[PDB]
Design goal:
Largest sheet of chain A: 6 strands, mixed
Assembly: dimeric
Bound molecules: adenosine-5'-diphosphate, calcium ion
Keywords: Structural Genomics Consortium, chaperone
CATH architecture of the largest domain in chain A: 2-Layer Sandwich
Number of helices of chain A: 13
Oligomer: homodimer
Entry title: Crystal structure of the human 70kDa heat shock protein 5 (BiP/GRP78) ATPase domain in complex with ADP
Helix content of chain A: 25-40%
Chains A, B: Heat shock 70kDa protein 5 (Glucose-regulated protein, 78kDa)
Shape of chain A: globular
PDB class: chaperone
Radius of gyration of chain A: 21 Å
């Protein structure tokens, strides 16, 4: 019927549709165009998806599930799983040599879910937000995945669709989707495209060569665990030790203070993508005392200096591996929420000797945008 | 002979001017009171830092900023104080200090950028002066009075040039140092070992130095009979073994080599250090650093057994100088009446266990906080000079 395009992202997902000549990115029933890729199990037996799952994360660390994409379609033995496991606050147990996620569901009950079951529940949220908008049922979808995903990861993403009641007609590589979003599907000779994708917890760089609807991912690279969250973390550290210094108080063991801080740091960072200062204020922050500081853009870039510079290495590396030089790159496509950071943009611009990157698509929505275009072609 | 405090000028302080930390105490109201600093810490890092912006930092704030400001953060000044340039100790040390040490008038001087385009050159005793000034001020905030006189401790092996240079450092700081006393003697005094003829072994293992001293006491007369040790072995080395294990392990679990990233290394060091301290009173320590390297996190458990294994050879080698002081002082291990263990690293259970086994089960002395014992003893002598 009407096929949806879904960006099923690490930290956020996005659903779009092609209806009456254009791509419509669909707002969820809480008013947002992207939805958190979170699922929570409450004590009272209630299953929450999205924003509701995420606002309930501090109070429910063990049964708020996220980052399912990091596990999806992998075996227990994957070195990547072996590391990730140590940092997830929910239980992951080995079963049939695959990661399974184990949560309490209330009434004394435990369940284990395959990562793809958890992703399934995210897809069910996207499905329902699509159907509400379209006024009708949705059964088919184009879902994107990272370019370095192997068959078992792709198949597992397809299985998620099925668990969710979607037929995932096509799986499309995220950089190709971003490429399609910017009209690089237009038939206009051979082009070498660098897609620089920077989300909340992951950095992917992809060199794609395009040739009249023939897309090839030549080389891929990145930092599997570098993202927007890390930039929040540099700033958190700065402020926690500044708070100690002024008030004598250390807040690190107080999960309530810490996460109120994280929440305001997150708001501050976002704002510092289009202002040079943001006031971080919290009332009754710690033992009755308030918190007030202004963060400058200068201080934000200073505290993240090297994380920002180190995004250049995977770029140089993908040009080496595809036997190209920076002069060979015809479009630079910047996608992922964190590419809104002017310094990131500036460091990329500078790297390519003044070339401006393509413009006119929303970086938070680009991958879903591309998927939706192809959904509309597939029909 | 006797010092009389007034209403404006307070009692005599005892100071442990140590290699990596210092501690100041006082005898007041019949007890030794070990004075906490403005940070709430009962020991203070023996560190001075000179920021770009012209601020001189001392203690914890100097140390807090050692990675970002390596060339202008000074420490280990005790390693150079009262020594000639030609001293083989100095020639070795300067190779390893991250701040500049030039020769002036045949003596080592420390040269730092003091802000505003200027450099200054400080004698090691000027740097210890600054540490002593922080200790002075800590005392004065506690006493609500000025502090003008002190008893300061030094290693048994210090010579006259080294003792004089410690006295001069007090002098630069405004402290009349009434008495210099040996650290192990100070440690003996804190355990009451001054109140027939006893033989005392003092095992002092700090952050960077290991000092063993054999001491006789006869009717309140102390004599340092033999001294030995490893002048560069201390708790910092035990961190170094654990650091190496994790840099290696991290490379092979994740591919990532972090060795030349000083921010990551410093971050690991802080957590290894905290871990170590915790393994002196529990059997496992978590080491968790968020965004350790290129956004990737770090998470590992260090067990006490793993900690002992990594340092096995280092711990056992602390027995060789204990044997040498016995040989050199012509005593058998059975001639030792008292074992005193002091220094923060003697909190390590395996170190306690090795010393105890070396003396066929003999228990060490116990009533005093091992990183405060040197100060405590100094503080007690401070009291006898002030009339209590
Ligand atoms: N205005 C902004 N400035 C800086 N970072 C932003 C902004 N908006 C979103 N981000 C960051 O984008 C990250 C999420 O990227 P996104 O692509 O939406 O999700 P995913 O992590 O699933 O790829 C978050 O860390 C968020 O803070
Ligand atoms: N609980 C503990 N367990 C193990 N080592 C400790 C503990 N507390 C302190 N230390 C070690 O003691 C060393 C410092 O000893 P100290 O006598 O305080 O100073 P100095 O080095 O100036 O003699 C440090 O290496 C520190 O890690
Ligand atoms: Ca994304
Ligand atoms: Ca050493
Ligand atoms: Ca990260
Ligand atoms: Ca000591």
């Amino acid at each position: 019927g009407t096929v949806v395009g879904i960006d099923l992202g690490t930290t956020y997902s996005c659903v779009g549709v092609f209806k009456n000549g254009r791509v419509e990115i669909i707002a969820n029933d809480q008013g947002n165009r992207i939805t958190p890729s979170y699922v929570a199990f409450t004590p009272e037996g209630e299953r929450l998806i999205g924003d509701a799952a995420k606002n309930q994360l501090t109070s429910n660390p063990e049964n708020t599930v996220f980052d399912a994409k990091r596990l999806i379609g992998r075996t227990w033995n994957d070195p990547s799983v072996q590391q990730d496991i140590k940092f997830l606050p929910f239980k992951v147990v080995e079963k049939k040599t695959k990661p399974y996620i184990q949560v309490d569901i209330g009434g004394g009950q435990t369940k284990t879910f395959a990562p793809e079951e958890i992703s399934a529940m995210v897809l069910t949220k996207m499905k329902e937000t699509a159907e509400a908008y379209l006024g009708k049922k949705v059964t088919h979808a184009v879902v994107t995945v990272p370019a370095y995903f192997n068959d078992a990861q792709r198949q597992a993403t397809k299985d998620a669709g099925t668990i969710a009641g979607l037929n995932v007609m096509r799986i499309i590589n995220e950089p190709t989707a971003a490429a399609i979003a910017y009209g690089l599907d237009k038939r206009e000779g051979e082009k070498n495209i660098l897609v620089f994708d920077l989300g909340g917890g992951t950095f992917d760089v992809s060199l794609l060569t395009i040739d009249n609807g023939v897309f090839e991912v030549v080389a891929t690279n990145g930092d599997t665990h570098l993202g927007g969250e890390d930039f929040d973390q540099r700033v958190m550290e700065h402020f926690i030790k500044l708070y100690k210094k002024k008030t004598g108080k250390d807040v690190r063991k107080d999960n309530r203070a810490v996460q109120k801080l994280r929440r305001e740091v997150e708001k501050a960072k976002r704002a510092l993508s289009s202002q040079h200062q943001a006031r971080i204020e919290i009332e009754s922050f710690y033992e009755g005392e308030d918190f007030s500081e202004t963060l400058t853009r200068a201080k934000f870039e200073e505290l993240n200096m090297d994380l920002f510079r180190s995004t250049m290495k995977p770029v140089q590396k993908v040009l080496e591996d595809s036997d190209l030089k920076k002069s060979d790159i015809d479009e630079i496509v910047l996608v992922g929420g964190s590419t809104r950071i002017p310094k990131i943009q500036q460091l990329v611009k500078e790297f390519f000797n003044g070339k401006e990157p393509s413009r006119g698509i929303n970086p938070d929505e680009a991958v879903a945008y591309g998927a939706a275009v192809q959904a509309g072609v597939l029909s």
